[PDB]
Structure 1
Amino acid sequence: SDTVFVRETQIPVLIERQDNVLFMLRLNAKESHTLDEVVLNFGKDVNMSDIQSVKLYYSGTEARQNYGKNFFAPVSYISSHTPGKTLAANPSYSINKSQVNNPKRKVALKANQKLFPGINYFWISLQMKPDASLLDKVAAKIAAIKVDNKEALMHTVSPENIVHRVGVGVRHAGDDGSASFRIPGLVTTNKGTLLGVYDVRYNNSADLQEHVDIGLSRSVDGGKTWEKMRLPLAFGETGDLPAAQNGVGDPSILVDTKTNTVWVVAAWTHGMGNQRAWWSSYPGMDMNHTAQLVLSKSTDDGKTWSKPINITEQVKDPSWYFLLQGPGRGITMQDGTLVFPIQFIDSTRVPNAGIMYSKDRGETWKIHNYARTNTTEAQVAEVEPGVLMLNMRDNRGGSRAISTTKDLGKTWTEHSSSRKALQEPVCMASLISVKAKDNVLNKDILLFSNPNTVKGRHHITIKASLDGGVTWLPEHQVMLDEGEGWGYSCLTMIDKETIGILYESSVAHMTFQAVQLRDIIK
């Protein structure tokens, strides 16, 4: 007989999307003629009232040289890059064979599809209602598949007990006339307001130098809805150079918890033609030679933003090629000191990560010594009072480098977890510390997020540690995005019980997801 192979997806279901890939079906029809229907059963706890529709699409066949490669689709069904074409399945790739609006817990999708004498691809689409809850979870099973009016044998290659989580596409390719959005940062203000910052890359997805601003999405309802985009940092035709030679990017955001003043730091590149700032910034101090470290602050819960504050003169050694913040977020230590992770290419052209701190509420800043050589992007958290843990992208590859300091970066101690506990593909990673009194578990925890792999940027994962970063137990992890993406992410606590994550996913340039703390630590 012919067997219908089923692969359930593990990717965010965007609430605003008209389509979301839920299942993929492959059928090599050696003895099959017609695929009549597919029967689907949603889980007992699923709220069907939040589901707008369920659809069955046919996507044709496969190239004969690709038979036996165990592919479940011939092409990407829903684009995350085509401006204005990221909300619905591409009609040229997928034929809508059936649709059920306002479905019941048991859904029958009739297809009546004449099968190609060979490989046939189908997939199931799930469309949520615009008002769907961020925390409700969707589970479903394929109960039966009818082929030639008889029950077809099924073999499911994906695992059981998959939990599909929804998310909000805070930024899609093309929004507000910008080709792409990258490099997320995410914080929660003292008033519970969510602030997410990112590169707005108008012309394309290339790094600096280019036409880039720092955009900000503000949410006052826990990430359900986001306010119109703001631009805390934009330099336009500064110095009478074109905007594409005045980009600002790689933002990092922090909240001064003592005052609720919000700070955003970024790297403004001036000149440099159309080349990458990583090898186009040079020693010196002024805009005409080296990238400038600029700040903007908000004293009204992120609604309005000040003019840029250039602190390059305070902290940059003139012999460095490039000084910039570590993208993502900063912190406020228990004693009130503000800390931003930073990275600089030194006089030998080697990058090193470290921290930059202010004891006077952000008026003056300081850098002492690097934590480790040949490291770049890093995130910092106060694991225990007075002890700063820096988690660093390591160009040696394969795993994160972790170090700690007790004197604000004058001296560093290599952590036991360094270069062993947390694998990476040399990407950016998020690290936050949540203190016992500020979370529902009444335990000090560390939350870490990154592509859980050594090659490629996929399987974006949040990991939790209860012993200050010594151990990251497998049962304390949630895999949110199996698809391929740009890999950058940033974490925050929405509330004492829920984590928020803003990251570059396979379904949207800026994707927001909410994960219950008890979901990770059960």
Structure 2
Amino acid sequence: SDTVFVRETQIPVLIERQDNVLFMLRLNAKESHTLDEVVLNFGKDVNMSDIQSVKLYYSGTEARQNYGKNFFAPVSYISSHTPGKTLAANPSYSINKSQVNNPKRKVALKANQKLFPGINYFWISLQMKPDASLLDKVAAKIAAIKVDNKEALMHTVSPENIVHRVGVGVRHAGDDGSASFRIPGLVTTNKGTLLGVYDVRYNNSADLQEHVDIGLSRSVDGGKTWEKMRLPLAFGETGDLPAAQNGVGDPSILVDTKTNTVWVVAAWTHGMGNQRAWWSSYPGMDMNHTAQLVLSKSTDDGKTWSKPINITEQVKDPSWYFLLQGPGRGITMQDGTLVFPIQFIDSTRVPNAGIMYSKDRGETWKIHNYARTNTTEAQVAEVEPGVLMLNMRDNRGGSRAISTTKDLGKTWTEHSSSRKALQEPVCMASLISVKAKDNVLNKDILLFSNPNTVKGRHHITIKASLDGGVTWLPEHQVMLDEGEGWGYSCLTMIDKETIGILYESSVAHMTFQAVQLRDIIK
């Protein structure tokens, strides 16, 4: 007898999407002729008034050579890549067989779908209310599938008690005329305002050099709604060159907690043809030879931004090929010191991570020594007062490097977790420190986010450490996105009990989610 296999997804449910893949179904119809209906029950705690519709789609069959590979779909159903067409299921891949608007907890979805004599794919789509709260959690179970007027056998390969979390697609492919958005940074101001920054990569998703601005989305309601995109840094046709030879990218953002002034640092690349700035920036100091380190500041909680402030000459060794920030965010130290992670390719063309700091509220910056050779993107957190922990993307592969410094980068001490505790596929990763005074657990905690793999950028995960980054217990981890994406992410605390994350996801170029601190540390 035939069996319907079910795979529940673990990806963000975007509130503004018209479709979100909730379940996939595979039926090899050796004897079945017609699928009549699917019955769904949402969990008892689901807020049904926040759900707009539930839909059953049929997506056809599979290539015969792929029978037996345990696939649950023939193709990706909802594009996150096609400009202007990432909110709804592609109708050429998926036929809407059933839809229920304003559903009850129990949903019957009538298909009456004639089955291909072979593999058949179906899937269930969840659409939220535009009004839905960011803390919504959705659970559901397929109760019954009727085939040829009989109850069909079912087998679920996905784990029990999946928690489906919602999110906001802050930026989608095509938005505001830009092909792509990448490289998130995220902070919370002293006024609780959320500020998320990113590359606006207009022509395609290529790294610098290209037509790239720094964009910024501002939320005054905890990430539920976002003001129209701002452009803190954009160089257009500066210095008489085309805009695509004036990109500025890889932003890092920090809040000066002593004054609430907000700083964005980025790498402005001038010239370099259409080639990658990693290989096209050279020794020197002016815009014709090397990438420029530029700042923009806001003294009004992120609403308006200064013209660019060039600090290259403060901190760049002329012998370096390329000095730029570590993308993501910076910090204010307890003693008021401002710190941005940085990275420089030295005279031998080897990259090294470190930090840059200001003791005068951002007027002047300085770099001492690198933390570790052959490392690039890094994030820094004050794990204990006066102790900066730098967590680094390591070109050796497979795991983050971690070191600490108590003299602002003069000397570095390798940490026990280094090259062991936090696996990576060589990719940006976020690290923040939350102090006992500032969170609902009255405990010092470290939060880290990245693709929890050694190969490929998928299974984006937030991990928590309770012993200052010595131990990252699998118990204290939340897996937000099992799909593939570009992998970058940046964390902040929305408030004393809620984590905010802005990251490159499988469902939107810039995806924002709120995760209760108690969900990850129960």
TM range (shorter): over 0.9
Cα deviation, 1:248-292, whole Å, max 9, x if unaligned, reads 000000000000000000000000000000000000000000000
Per the TM alignment, residue 227 of structure 1 is displaced from its structure 2 partner at its CA by 0.1
Residues of 1 paired with 2:321 and 2:273: CA distance?
Answer: 17
Per the TM alignment, residue 67 of structure 1 is displaced from its structure 2 partner at its CA by 0.6
Residues of 1 paired with 2:121 and 2:292: CA distance?
Answer: 52
Residues of 1 paired with 2:412 and 2:90: CA distance?
Answer: 52
Q: Any idea what SS the aligned residue of 1:501 has?
A: strand
Unaligned runs of 5+ in 2: none
Residues of 1 paired with 2:347 and 2:211: CA distance?
Answer: 28
Aligned partner of 1:132 in structure 2 is 132
Residues of 1 paired with 2:462 and 2:139: CA distance?
Answer: 20
Residues of 1 paired with 2:480 and 2:144: CA distance?
Answer: 27
Residues of 1 paired with 2:22 and 2:444: CA distance?
Answer: 36
How many residue pairs get matched? 522
Residues of 2 paired with 1:335 and 1:67: CA distance?
Answer: 62
Residues of 2 paired with 1:136 and 1:94: CA distance?
Answer: 27
Per the TM alignment, residue 39 of structure 1 is displaced from its structure 2 partner at its CA by 0.3
Residues of 1 paired with 2:492 and 2:369: CA distance?
Answer: 27
Per the TM alignment, residue 449 of structure 1 is displaced from its structure 2 partner at its CA by 0.1
Per the TM alignment, residue 431 of structure 1 is displaced from its structure 2 partner at its CA by 0.1
Residues of 1 paired with 2:136 and 2:28: CA distance?
Answer: 36
Residues of 2 paired with 1:68 and 1:240: CA distance?
Answer: 59
Aligned partner of 2:291 in structure 1 is 291
Per the TM alignment, residue 222 of structure 1 is displaced from its structure 2 partner at its CA by 0.1
Cα deviation, 1:449-488, whole Å, max 9, x if unaligned, reads 0000000000000000000000000110000000000000
Q: Given the alignment of the two structures, is residue 3 of structure 1 paired with residue 3 of structure 2, yes or no?
A: yes
Per the TM alignment, residue 209 of structure 1 is displaced from its structure 2 partner at its CA by 0.2
Cα deviation, 1:355-390, whole Å, max 9, x if unaligned, reads 000000000000000000000000000000000000
Aligned partner of 1:301 in structure 2 is 301
CA RMSD of aligned residues (A): 0.3
Per the TM alignment, residue 95 of structure 1 is displaced from its structure 2 partner at its CA by 0.1
Q: Any idea what SS the aligned residue of 1:343 has?
A: strand
Aligned partner of 2:251 in structure 1 is 251
Cα deviation, 1:165-214, whole Å, max 9, x if unaligned, reads 00000000000000000000000000000000000000000000000000
Aligned partner of 1:407 in structure 2 is 407
Q: Any idea what SS the aligned residue of 2:294 has?
A: strand
Cα deviation, 1:140-162, whole Å, max 9, x if unaligned, reads 00000001011111110000000
Aligned partner of 2:33 in structure 1 is 33
Q: Any idea what SS the aligned residue of 1:210 has?
A: coil
Aligned partner of 1:72 in structure 2 is 72
Residues of 2 paired with 1:136 and 1:167: CA distance?
Answer: 9
Unaligned runs of 5+ in 1: none
Aligned partner of 1:358 in structure 2 is 358
Per the TM alignment, residue 350 of structure 1 is displaced from its structure 2 partner at its CA by 0.3
Cα deviation, 1:391-412, whole Å, max 9, x if unaligned, reads 0000000000000000000000
What does residue range 348-497 of structure 1 map to in structure 2 within 5 Å?
348-497=348-497
Per the TM alignment, residue 112 of structure 1 is displaced from its structure 2 partner at its CA by 0.2
What does residue range 87-486 of structure 1 map to in structure 2 within 5 Å?
87-486=87-486
Per the TM alignment, residue 416 of structure 1 is displaced from its structure 2 partner at its CA by 0.2
Per the TM alignment, residue 136 of structure 1 is displaced from its structure 2 partner at its CA by 1.4
Cα deviation, 1:410-432, whole Å, max 9, x if unaligned, reads 00000000000000000000000
Residues of 2 paired with 1:333 and 1:84: CA distance?
Answer: 42
Q: Any idea what SS the aligned residue of 1:41 has?
A: strand
Residues of 2 paired with 1:260 and 1:314: CA distance?
Answer: 23
Q: Any idea what SS the aligned residue of 2:59 has?
A: strand
Residues of 2 paired with 1:308 and 1:180: CA distance?
Answer: 23
Aligned partner of 1:50 in structure 2 is 50
Residues of 1 paired with 2:427 and 2:2: CA distance?
Answer: 43
Aligned partner of 1:81 in structure 2 is 81
User: What percent of counterpart residues are identical?
Assistant: 100
Q: Any idea what SS the aligned residue of 2:284 has?
A: coil
Cα deviation, 1:48-74, whole Å, max 9, x if unaligned, reads 000000000000000001111100000
Q: Any idea what SS the aligned residue of 1:519 has?
A: helix
Residues of 1 paired with 2:462 and 2:236: CA distance?
Answer: 37
Residues of 2 paired with 1:79 and 1:373: CA distance?
Answer: 39
Residues of 2 paired with 1:318 and 1:245: CA distance?
Answer: 22
Residues of 1 paired with 2:180 and 2:472: CA distance?
Answer: 34
Per the TM alignment, residue 328 of structure 1 is displaced from its structure 2 partner at its CA by 0.1
What TM-score do you get using the length of structure 1 for normalisation? Answer: 1.00
Aligned partner of 1:518 in structure 2 is 518
Cα deviation, 1:26-52, whole Å, max 9, x if unaligned, reads 000001000000000000000000000
Residues of 2 paired with 1:416 and 1:329: CA distance?
Answer: 24
Cα deviation, 1:297-328, whole Å, max 9, x if unaligned, reads 00000000001010000000000000000000
Cα deviation, 1:491-518, whole Å, max 9, x if unaligned, reads 0000000000000000000000000000
